[PDB]
């Protein structure tokens, strides 16, 4: 049930080119050994360490953001430590994060959204699970794991992340 939604200015962009611009604007939140605070942790909606959404804003520019949606839980110090797992079904990208407390997170100026991703991983796969690799890559400004997961969805339509948004819409609508 894969779907894409995009501002019409991105119709002629490849998926890869959009995500490359998004990543280079968002930068890298450096959520790493020795550098984690409240500033670069992001947050969940629906719980403190789990919920229907996870979202985070750029520490470089304070506005660029992404919202990950589905059913997600982070183990924090439970084994395997520091793993995000569960189901990742949507991702949205753009500028400005609001909500996240008594209402869901949303992006204030949305560029692109993917729905129906159907990505699922179990706790026991720890950091090798696809949902962990995708979202921790995004937090780090690395879209390599998401593109790999999108190529695996797209190959069934004969497309890839080198296809443009308009080419994907014509195959999926
Ligand atoms: C849900 C998305 C998240 C992912 C994918 C994630 C991923 C990670 C990873 C891979 C590490 C370990 C080692 C390293 O970064 O070099 C880590 C460390 C850590 N994370 Fe997260 N994290 C997430 C959210 C959070 C949140 C919401 C908190 C809240 C406090 C948090 C707190 C920490 C702490 C305290 C550490 C250890 C820092 C240290 O050992 O110096 N993480 N996280
Ligand atoms: Ca440490």
Query: Ligand 2 mean position to 88 CA, how many Å?
Result: 27
Backbone phi and psi for residue 120, each to the nearest 5 degrees, phi listed first: -145, 135
Instruction: Give the β-pairing of 64-74 and 50-57.
Output: antiparallel
> What span, in angstroms and rounded, lies between the C-alpha atoms of 97 and 159?
31
User: What Å distances lie between residue 109 and 6, 97, 141, CA to CA?
Assistant: 11, 9, 19
Give the torsion sign (CA, 41, 138, 21, 113). Answer: negative
22 C-alpha to center of ligand 2: Å? Answer: 29
CB-defined site of ligand 1, < 6 Å: 31-34, 36, 41-42, 54, 74, 82, 84, 132, 135-136
Closest atom of ligand 1 relative to the 38 alpha carbon:
30
- How would you label 100-138 residue by residue, b for 16+ Cβ within 10 Å and e otherwise? beeebbbbeebbbbbeebebebebeebeebbbbbbbbbb
Beta-bridge partner residues of 10: none
Q: Report how far residue 124's alpha carbon sits from residue 29's, in angstroms, rounded to the nearest whole number.
A: 26
What's the first-to-final CA gap in the chain, in angstroms? 10
* Fold of the domain built from segment(s) 1-173: Heme-binding Protein A; Chain: A; (3.30.1500)
The domain locations on the chain are: 1-173
What Å distances lie between residue 89 and 9, 15, 59, CA to CA? 24, 17, 25
The number of angstroms, rounded, from the C-alpha of 58 to the middle of its chain's C-alpha atoms is: 13
Residues 90/114, Cβ–Cβ less than 8 Å: yes
Judged by DSSP in three states, 127 sits in helix
Burial class of residue 79 (count of CB atoms within 10 Å of its CB; 0-12, 13-18, 19+): exposed
Per-residue tokens: 116: 């129906």
What determination technique applies here? X-ray
Q: Treating both helix axes as pointing N-terminal to C-terminal, what angle do 15-26 and 144-154 enclose, rounded to 10 degrees? A: 160
């Amino acid at each position: 049930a894969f779907s894409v939604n995009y501002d019409s200015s991105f119709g002629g962009y490849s998926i890869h080119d959009y995500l490359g611009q998004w990543a280079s604007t968002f930068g890298d939140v450096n959520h790493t050994n020795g550098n984690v605070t409240d500033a670069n942790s992001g947050g969940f909606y629906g719980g403190s360490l789990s919920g229907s959404q996870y979202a985070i804003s750029s520490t470089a520019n304070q506005v660029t953001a992404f919202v990950a949606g589905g059913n997600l839980t982070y183990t924090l110090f439970n084994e395997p430590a520091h793993t995000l797992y569960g189901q990742l079904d949507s991702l949205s990208f753009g500028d400005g994060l609001s909500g996240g407390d008594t209402s869901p997170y949303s992006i204030q100026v949305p560029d692109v959204s993917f729905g129906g991703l159907n990505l699922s991983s179990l706790q026991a796969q720890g950091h090798d699970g696809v949902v962990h690799q995708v979202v921790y890559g995004l937090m780090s400004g690395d879209t390599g794991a998401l593109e790999t997961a999108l190529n695996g969805i797209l190959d069934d339509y004969g497309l890839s992340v080198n296809s443009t948004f308009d080419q994907v819409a014509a195959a999926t609508a």
